[PDB]
A and B are shown apart, each in its own frame.
With several copies, the nearest count.
Chain A
Amino acid sequence: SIEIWYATSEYLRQEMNPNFRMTDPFNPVHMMSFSGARGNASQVHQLVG
């Protein structure tokens, strides 16, 4: 139970950025963190993953 749900959680974070890069490059969440302005991938994963 621990490892199957950790692997699923980690896979969502890996695919979070390519999903933003190819389908919604100008998404406000992506731009707020890809530009290095405020927030990192881990915090965005807590919101969308």
Chain B
Amino acid sequence: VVDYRINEDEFHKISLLDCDFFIRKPPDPDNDVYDFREMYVTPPDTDIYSVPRVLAPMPQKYIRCAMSDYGCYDVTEPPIDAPRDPLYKSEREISKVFLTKHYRNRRLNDPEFVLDFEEIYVIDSKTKSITRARVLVTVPGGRKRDRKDDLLVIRDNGNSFKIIHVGERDDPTTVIEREEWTKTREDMEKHLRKLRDFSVSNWF
């Protein structure tokens, strides 16, 4: 907790479900430049600033980054009190924000712009903290490779970060079917385990 009210005109206000995250913003026409030296976390819509918890080394030089939120949708059916009350209410519950550095701080308008997936910082609303992503790379090339051909996969509630070739992209149908097959297989094994000939039975 700090004892002063910062000026939000020079900060990146990142709003999440449980808090509002502030990162000092160096002036830039693109407004994609971030200064991680000064940071603050506040409860949503509150000017009581506090230093956020840091779980990893933070950059010291200005880096251009691309912001993308992570969360779910809250489609609820609110009770109908007044005439013409809405039948449903949909709101975006953002729980994580990923900051991905541009390759060599290249601008978006640059014809050679690519994203550097090895440099991702994760902002967590529940813990009011900021961390660096544990990125695992499988594309051949190592440090020196063509960044135009890599694809990032984020799983496990924004905790698993993996870099794969764009050619081995997985269909959304395949992902959904994999999850369904795994869960239903475990459920079926749990249901059948209570039968007394289960130990002398086969799966098929």
A-to-B contact residues, CB < 8 Å: 18, 22
Minimum Cβ distance to chain B for residue A25 (Å): 11
The answer to whether the Cβ of B93 comes within 8 Å of any Cβ in the partner chain is: no
Minimum Cβ distance to chain B for residue A30 (Å): 15
Residues from chain A with Cβ under 8 Å of B72 in the complex: none
The answer to whether the Cβ of B10 comes within 8 Å of any Cβ in the partner chain is: no
The answer to whether the Cβ of B149 comes within 8 Å of any Cβ in the partner chain is: no
**Lowest 4 A-B CB distances belong to which pairs?**
A22-B191, A22-B188, A18-B191, A22-B187
Residues from chain A with Cβ under 8 Å of B187 in the complex: 22
Residues of B174-204 whose CB lies within 8 A of A = 187-188, 191
B-to-A contact residues, CB < 8 Å: 187-188, 191
- B194 closest partner in A (C-beta): A15
Residues from chain A with Cβ under 8 Å of B188 in the complex: 22
- A23 closest partner in B (C-beta): B191
Minimum Cβ distance to chain A for residue B44 (Å): 41
- A15 closest partner in B (C-beta): B194
Residues from chain B with Cβ under 8 Å of A18 in the complex: 191
List 4 contacting pairs A-B, 8 Å CB cutoff, sorted by A. Answer: A18-B191, A22-B187, A22-B188, A22-B191
Residues from chain B with Cβ under 8 Å of A22 in the complex: 187-188, 191
Minimum Cβ distance to chain A for residue B201 (Å): 14
Minimum Cβ distance to chain B for residue A23 (Å): 8
- A19 closest partner in B (C-beta): B191
- B184 closest partner in A (C-beta): A22
Minimum Cβ distance to chain A for residue B181 (Å): 15
Residues from chain A with Cβ under 8 Å of B191 in the complex: 18, 22
- B190 closest partner in A (C-beta): A22
Minimum Cβ distance to chain A for residue B198 (Å): 14
- A22 closest partner in B (C-beta): B191
Minimum Cβ distance to chain A for residue B186 (Å): 12
Minimum Cβ distance to chain A for residue B197 (Å): 15
Minimum Cβ distance to chain A for residue B188 (Å): 6
